[PDB]
Amino acid sequence: MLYVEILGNLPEMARDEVKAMLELGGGEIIGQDYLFLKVDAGEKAFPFLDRLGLAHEYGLLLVEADSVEELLQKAGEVEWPIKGAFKVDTETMANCRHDVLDLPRKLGAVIHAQGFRVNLSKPDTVVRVYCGERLYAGIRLRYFDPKDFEKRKAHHRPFFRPISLHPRVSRALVNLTKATREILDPFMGAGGILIEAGLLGLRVYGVDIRPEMVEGAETNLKHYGVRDYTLKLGDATRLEDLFPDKKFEAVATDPPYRKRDELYRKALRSIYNVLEDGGRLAIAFPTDFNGKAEAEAVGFRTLGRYYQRVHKSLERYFYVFEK
């Protein structure tokens, strides 16, 4: 069994991101306790879980219990796969129903008895306990450092434009398409979404109507070590003209905020036409555009819609559509 802890800011989007990666990884979510996800999946899912943008960490789930007593009892029957020295780190979620003070000491005693040593300052293995409705214990396999994403914000790129989504959200949009080979962004701008896609090891395609953006996105893509890119100056409403005999696995994009609605409608039509059957489109639109209705008109099925306020006079939805 595995566990994933998701971020709470966009929690439905985050859970759906995990679902998407687990589908690629042959698993599924079995339970949810506040922002802790109980996951039925194996090592096959690891390379996909490694892609996540809206998760704090994931790991092995070794014990679940309904009391500290039961947690410690069951932990004794587990053969803990500890590497090097360890420590126990408890996560008290907002709905924690259990007295977990000194739990790191107690559980560490149980694990210490199996032949392993505690190092509080520098652990090699971090044993985790989550406390919500129930208690869960296991081993952390990957921590997603917020710092890594903050360092990729727009102002840290060689080509600076203050237009991007948060890198975590850009990454989540790519993942929600379940792309495993490639992705196209037809409104690439400074390249925020294509940067995440490229860091995930995908082949990327980008379009922008502005030569400076086409140049600028390339500078940023090179900066982050993305090499398999194809960037074109052009019209996102004419993708079939742009990429004649190409059907794309997936599309992810943050369009600019022609009349606006006209651009959006024509872009949806054009994206639909160049998408593979079964292909997905992850896309943001301001809330006053009827994105669901307009995408469904061109043939899309709606898989997700997630609300977000941008600032005091702008709200948007993130969408996931399927062809």
**Residue set of the binding site for S-adenosyl-L-methionine:** 193, 208, 235-236
Does residue 281 contact residue 310 with C-beta atoms inside 8 Å? no
R_g of the chain, CA atoms, integer Å: 22
The CA distance from 281 to 300, in Å, is 9
Does residue 171 contact residue 51 with C-beta atoms inside 8 Å? yes
List binding-site positions: 193, 208, 235-236
Cβ-proximal residues to 150 (8 Å cutoff; 6+ apart), any chain: 167
Handedness of CA 92, 96, 102, 104 (dihedral sign): negative
Residues 28-63 as b/e (b if ≥16 CB within 10 A, e otherwise) read: ebeebbbbbbbbebeeebeebbebbbbbbbbbbbbb
In eight-state DSSP terms, residue 118 is B
Which of 256, 253, 56, 63 minimizes the C-alpha distance to 161? 256
Alpha-carbon distance values, 264 to 9, 174, 190, 304 (Å): 27, 19, 19, 18
The CA distance from 59 to 51, in Å, is 14
Does residue 243 contact residue 205 with C-beta atoms inside 8 Å? yes
Does residue 226 contact residue 195 with C-beta atoms inside 8 Å? yes
